[PDB]
Design a protein around this nucleic acid. Structure first.
Lengths: 56, 135, 91, 97, 50, 252, 77
RNA sequence: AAUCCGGUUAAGAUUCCGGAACCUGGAUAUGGAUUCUUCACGGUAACGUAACUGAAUGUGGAGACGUCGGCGCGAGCCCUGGGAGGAGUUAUCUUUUCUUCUUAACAGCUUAUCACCCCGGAAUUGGUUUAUCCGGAGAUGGGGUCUUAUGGCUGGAAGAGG
RNA sequence: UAGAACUGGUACGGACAAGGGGAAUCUGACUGUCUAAUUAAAACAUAGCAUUGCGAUGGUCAGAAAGUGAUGUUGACGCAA
RNA sequence: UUUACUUAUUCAAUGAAGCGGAGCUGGAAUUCAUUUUCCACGUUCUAGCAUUCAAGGUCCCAUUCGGGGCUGAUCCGGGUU
């Protein structure tokens, strides 16, 4: 029950991962991969602006 | 044609170190005696150094630049490999199968790995490997 | 077997209500309680609940759409109009 | 079109189906071609794009969903992504990929 | 569960299992002994086709 | 003598809206600087059932541009949006289904809905289940825009008033027969207090002006003046013609 | 409340200086199906909960009663 | 937010008495754990361990919930067997007929559908429900992880009640 | 659950419990609702069909008045008559 | 005549957040002397993220661990639109 969580230790309320007790594993998996690939792809989004805008 | 070489940066997606950047120090495509799957021994950081500015005092700089590393066997399915690299041959000869069981040797390895990551963070080559994968 | 000669699902209504109203209900409850293809995962698993809302059972995709079918005919042409009206800006 | 080509590969060469075996046969570099379906999720699609630019393997988008790809390769179950590892009679590795 | 322990006992393979299972979802078998008598006849037909 | 029913609706004791299960007001984003110069990307979290609306709603979330938080708004879901689609609001936002654009940024002939009357009042016209307005013309003189409302009446509004692209989900709703009285009952217990509709011929001459008499008949003429006092207006209101309509549609 | 199974932990409990009262209880229960034998329980009362120890063997229990600290008030049976 | 059993009265008790708990609030000392790899380790993983800094601010969950149908599972009642006590019947018959044989909150270890992880790869399509759903977006299979409403054992506790 | 003998002053859902049925016409389609203390109906309601008003500095209505309110957490597949 | 007015009046919205005018870089644009004009003037495969008067650059304090100023983020007018 929602106020019983206070009486208990932290290892019952949390699993060890980042975004541990709030999101589940698979979802966390997705928000690493997306959070990698987009902020790798955005790197490509700057190598286009250095070549299209310069060789215009 | 083989991009899991022993210098590649990877990102651990599973485990307690999820979202934390490692480098492969030794891959194993066939596996091993135990671990019946393609695994790789990696070493990465657990606490990122914080954004030190112009106006931090020197001692309060150094407590920012502490780095907590870790060595770990990780399956290939739990790593994103990436195009970034890191020179590994300083602590290549430390992290091995013998570095494990008798875990007192693990802290001896973490000493070497921490010293290597601080000596690379000073003279700040590899800026992306030490920046927080903000996810 | 086929336990009704023609009525089918509107046999839950029985005798009453007319025949034209019951066949007009049949025509829409076949479409309403059907199992549609999912546009994203390709598995024929999109049902509905709460008219206007078509959730895929797996894959968690929740496509809005027509009340009694996924894409009504007066909307499937609208996107084609949009497909016509996005081309004029460039080519 | 490409379907006669994939059918000739599928009865002449060696391949694997589905995402996990593409990544398994792609980490080992045994891949020569991957073919991604159209209705695939964009995250899966970008994760297989990103492994192409490490392994230097060519990527051909299959226009049309995984149903049509499964029907094209001769199976009955759907398949989102195919990995050709040895082409046989057909030479799709060198056509326009 | 008779089909289940027949499959797990190796007395029958999974192809004949998935035939007889969706047949048992229909009637096709009034009782347990009748199903065993059906399996004996089909397995004897398979042996006479061997 | 007695105060008749449509007079009695207005003070609003029991005739109020039944507003418990409703999620909230279904408005658009407030027109601000991030909207009318660039384009802001939000996602749509959840498209949820509203109670008493025909159309389904849509939980769209936005970044606040000024303080670090997330402001959720609820759009009326255009037909063909799913959860996880990105929604681009604003002046320079591109033209796809579900985006919301000011009407100066669309070509004429475009099918939009939830559009505004005056710019900024967050979504007035064409909101119900299945409807849409079509932009039929632009006017760079005093930047107006001539559109087609769902009654077939044409209206000239500003091009600064925003509208979201596409028809509204929940369409085709009134095609199905409402076979029994239980479905009309369960319908109107979510909307408001106006069912059953007791005919005004049945009742006594205190209850209604169509009442009384040894036959149920309407008495005098049942097309009533616009200039009638509040309380006489009982039947067809200000009718210019009546009777069963004849002829084709798409009038002049 | 609890059951505490460690003898040296129980000796630590007896010297915890909040334990003012203890008591001993005797029962008779039978091994596997054959034979009745004497069982004992040692109960120390802490300020929150009651800590017990179950001893089936009299050859340890008789030495353990000797091993209690003498300042404790032991309700014997 | 947090409680139960047994007893007590001419009349009160989940309120008194005895035994046993729990929660909130506020004080605080002692161990344990952490540290010269200054703010923990293990496991491929799912996650686990008595503990294992963390503000402003943001997000997420709980509180949070329709009715109907069968299906599974537990609890209490019911039926019933063996044995150990008491009462009744008996002209004859009846290993007979009735009655007692109980166990609380709370605590420790353990225990489940569903969900999930790894290995592996499927059409001679295969798993499976009472109800036809599920699978290359990776099943069947081998080995695991978790929730603990529930059950069992042990403590409370046979020193109580019968 | 089905069958078989054998037997009973042809009795056997033995007490209890527990449909009378058919041929028609008038009438309202139906389930529903009401005159609580004489009327339960063929009346009212209903789905269905149709009509009328109105694009909000609006349509219907309220308020003694208001910097007021009901439909309206509304928009013509809508509200209202 | 109704046109052109904002300050009255009336409506509407926002925890009155970027309004008006000018300039900058690009660029359509053709020069009939030099610019006569007008547009733009940080984000689009992805259900990730975005907060500590902001990092950097520059000037100070009196160097302590730190703190201040300008710019980064153009000026002008104080009519929220």
């Amino acid at each position: 029950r929602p106020r019983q969580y206070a009486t208990v230790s932290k290892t019952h309320k949390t699993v060890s991962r980042a975004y541990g007790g709030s999101r589940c594993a698979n979802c966390v998996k997705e928000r690493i991969i997306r959070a990698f690939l987009i902020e790798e792809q955005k790197i490509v989004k700057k190598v286009v602006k250095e070549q299209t805008e310069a060789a215009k | 044609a083989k991009f899991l070489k022993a210098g590649k940066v990877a990102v651990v997606v599973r485990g307690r170190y999820a979202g934390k950047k490692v480098v492969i120090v030794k891959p194993h495509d066939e596996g091993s005696k135990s671990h019946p799957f393609g695994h790789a021994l990696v070493a990465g950081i657990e606490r990122y150094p914080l954004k030190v500015t112009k106006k931090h005092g020197a001692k309060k700089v150094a407590k920012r630049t502490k780095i907590k590393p870790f060595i770990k066997v990780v399956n290939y399915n739990h790593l994103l490999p990436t195009r970034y690299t890191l020179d590994v041959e300083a602590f290549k000869s430390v992290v091995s199968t013998e570095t494990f069981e008798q875990p007192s040797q693990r802290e001896e390895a973490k000493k070497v790995v921490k010293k290597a990551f601080e000596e690379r963070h000073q003279a700040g080559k590899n800026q992306w490997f030490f920046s927080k994968l903000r996810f | 077997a086929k336990r009704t000669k023609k009525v089918g699902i509107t046999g839950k209504y029985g005798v009453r209500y007319g025949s034209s109203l019951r066949r007009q209900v049949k025509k829409l409850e076949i479409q309403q309680h059907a199992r549609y293809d999912c546009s994203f995962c390709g598995k024929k698993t999109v049902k509905r609940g709460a008219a206007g809302i078509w959730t895929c059972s797996c894959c968690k995709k929740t496509v809005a759409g027509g009340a009694y079918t996924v894409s009504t005919a007066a909307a499937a042409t609208v996107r084609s109009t949009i497909r016509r009206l996005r081309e004029m800006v460039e080519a | 079109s490409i379907n006669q080509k994939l059918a000739l590969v599928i009865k002449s060469g060696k391949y694997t189906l589905g995402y996990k075996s593409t990544v398994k046969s792609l980490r080992q570099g045994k891949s020569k071609l991957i073919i991604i379906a159209a209705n695939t999720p964009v995250l899966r699609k970008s994760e297989l794009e990103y492994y192409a630019m490490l392994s230097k393997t060519k990527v051909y988008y299959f226009q049309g969903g995984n149903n049509e790809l499964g029907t094209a390769v001769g199976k009955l179950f759907r398949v989102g992504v195919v990995s050709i590892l040895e082409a046989g009679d057909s030479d799709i590795l060198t056509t326009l990929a | 569960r008779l089909l289940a322990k027949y499959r797990d006992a190796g007395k029958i393979d999974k192809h004949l299992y998935h035939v007889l299972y969706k047949e048992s979802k229909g009637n096709a078998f009034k009782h347990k002994r009748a199903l065993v008598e059906h399996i004996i006849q089909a397995k004897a037909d398979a042996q006479r086709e061997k | 003598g007695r105060v008749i029913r449509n007079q009695r609706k207005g003070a609003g004791s029991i005739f109020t809206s039944h507003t418990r299960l409703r999620q909230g007001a279904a408005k658009l984003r407030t027109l601000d600087y991030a909207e009318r110069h660039g384009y802001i990307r939000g996602i749509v979290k959840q498209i949820v059932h509203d109670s008493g609306r025909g159309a389904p709603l849509a939980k769209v979330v936005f970044r606040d541009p000024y303080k670090y938080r997330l402001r959720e708004e609820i759009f009326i879901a255009n037909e063909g949006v799913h959860t996880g689609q990105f929604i681009y609001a604003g002046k320079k936002a591109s033209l796809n289904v579900g985006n919301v654009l000011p009407l100066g940024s669309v070509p004429e002939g475009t099918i939009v809905s939830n559009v505004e009357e005056k710019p900024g009042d967050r979504g007035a016209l064409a909101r119900a289940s299945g409807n849409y307005v079509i932009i039929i013309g632009h006017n760079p003189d005093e930047n107006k825009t001539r559109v087609r409302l769902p009654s077939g009446a044409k209206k000239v509004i500003s091009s600064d008033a925003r509208g979201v692209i596409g028809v509204i989900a929940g369409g085709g709703r009134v095609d199905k027969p409402l076979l029994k009285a239980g479905r009309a009952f369960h319908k109107y217990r979510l909307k408001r207090n106006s069912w059953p509709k007791t005919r005004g011929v049945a009742m006594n001459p205190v209850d209604h002006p169509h009442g009384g008499g040894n036959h149920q008949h309407i008495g005098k003429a049942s097309t009533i003046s616009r200039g009638a006092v509040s309380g006489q207006k009982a039947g067809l209101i200000a009718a210019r013609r009546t009777g069963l309509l004849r002829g084709s549609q798409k009038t002049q | 409340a609890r059951e505490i199974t460690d003898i040296k932990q129980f000796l630590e409990l007896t010297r915890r200086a909040d334990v003012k009262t203890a008591t001993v209880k005797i029962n008779k229960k039978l091994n596997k199906a054959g034979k009745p034998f004497r069982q004992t329980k040692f109960k120390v009362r802490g300020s929150s909960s009651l800590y017990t120890l179950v001893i089936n063997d009299a050859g340890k229990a008789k030495k353990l009663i000797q091993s209690l600290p003498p300042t404790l008030k032991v309700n014997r049976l």
